[PDB]
Design a protein around this ligand. Structure first.
Ligand SMILES: Nc1ncnc2c1ncn2[C@@H]1O[C@H](COP(=O)(O)OP(=O)(O)O)[C@@H](O)[C@H]1O
Lengths: 269, 55
């Protein structure tokens, strides 16, 4: 991780970074994960320190050495893909990248289901309703909601049954179920860590959600689906498909639903 | 009336000072509600409707 390597003295940060690569080769196959990449290797043109410019050069050479270190893959994480020195993203080195972003409503439900695998839920618990209400929440926040709801159920029942100790009877644990009130309480206590960032997802709006505009709904299908559903006709007649359409008119007529509805049918973000 | 000195001699249970989950959750809920009440934007009529309950 960036800040730990940077907390070291000059020479120690470079040696420690090199050791990780040498150990990975000895333990190959191996994966080296560098967290807070922007902290260990910030843009050189954005800093003044010699040590920061040096550690970037050290990482750049170690990344190039991966052509010799067989079966070693280096992964890294940052908050913004453009907050790191661009040299790291040149051919070779970190030549691949994946946008993780923020889970959508379906993913948030999946996360809640994952972090409830062991939890006994009451019939009134509705995690889909929670996933729709938890706008701006990420997996770290949804995990907190599951654990906090578990604790509330444990304190209401089990804490009046058990001692302040580390060992509990299996039957007492199994008798404890978490109700919707405990999830709602946790929801009021938690605060989304990613509420301002834009969230990109496949929308749930379908054509049945739009009143009127029957010809526009069809027109969008012709503009978006036909160029790939019938490509032989576009080639046959020398047609150049349009790259987009502009909508104009009064507000509040469904313009947002038109773009979402075609994205929904096409299973597109 | 005549007070009896014996009325002031009482020993508490050892568990007296150990608060329950309901007593601790109630206090923390009231702490959150007290901060929320200070944050609420409301007119004088809504303020009096609550205050008048104790009269
Ligand atoms: N033609 C329509 N059919 C059904 N609902 C509509 C229609 N037009 C607008 N709405 C409703 O109005 C809301 C706002 O629509 P939107 O296109 O976001 O307006 P804006 O011009 O402010 O973007 C939507 O959530 C939708 O539910």
């Amino acid at each position: 991780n960036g800040p730990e390597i940077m907390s070291k003295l000059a020479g120690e940060s470079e040696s420690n970074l090199r050791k990780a690569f040498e150990e990975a080769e000895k333990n190959a196959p191996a994966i080296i994960f560098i967290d807070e990449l922007d902290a260990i290797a910030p843009k050189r043109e954005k800093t003044h320190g010699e040590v920061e410019r040096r550690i970037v050069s050290q990482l750049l050479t170690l990344m190039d050495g991966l052509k010799q270190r067989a079966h070693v893959i280096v992964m890294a994480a940052t908050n913004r893909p453009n907050s790191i020195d661009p040299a790291l993203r040149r051919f070779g080195r970190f030549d691949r990248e994946v946008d993780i972003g923020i889970p959508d409503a379906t993913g948030r439900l999946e996360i809640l289901q994952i972090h409830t695998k062991n939890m006994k839920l009451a019939d009134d618990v509705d995690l889909e309703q929670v996933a729709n209400e938890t706008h701006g929440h990420v997996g770290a926040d949804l995990a907190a909601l599951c654990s906090e709801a578990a604790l509330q159920a444990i304190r209401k029942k089990m804490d009046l049954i058990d001692l302040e100790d580390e060992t509990i009877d299996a039957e007492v644990m199994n008798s404890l179920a978490v109700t919707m009130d405990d999830f709602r309480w946790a929801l009021s206590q938690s605060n989304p860590s990613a509420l301002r960032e834009t969230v990109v997802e496949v929308p749930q709006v379908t054509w049945e959600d739009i009143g009127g505009l029957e010809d526009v709904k069809r027109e969008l299908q012709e503009l978006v689906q036909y160029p790939v559903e019938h490509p032989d006709k576009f080639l046959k007649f020398g047609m150049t498909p349009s790259k987009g359409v502009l909508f104009y008119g009064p507000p509040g007529c469904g313009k947002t639903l038109l773009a979402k509805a075609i994205a929904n049918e096409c299973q597109a973000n | 009336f005549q007070p009896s000195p014996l009325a002031s001699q009482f020993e508490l249970p050892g568990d007296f000072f150990n608060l329950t989950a309901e007593e601790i959750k109630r206090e923390q809920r009231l702490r959150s509600e007290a901060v929320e009440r200070l944050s609420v934007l409301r007119t004088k009529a809504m303020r009096e409707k609550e205050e008048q309950r104790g009269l």
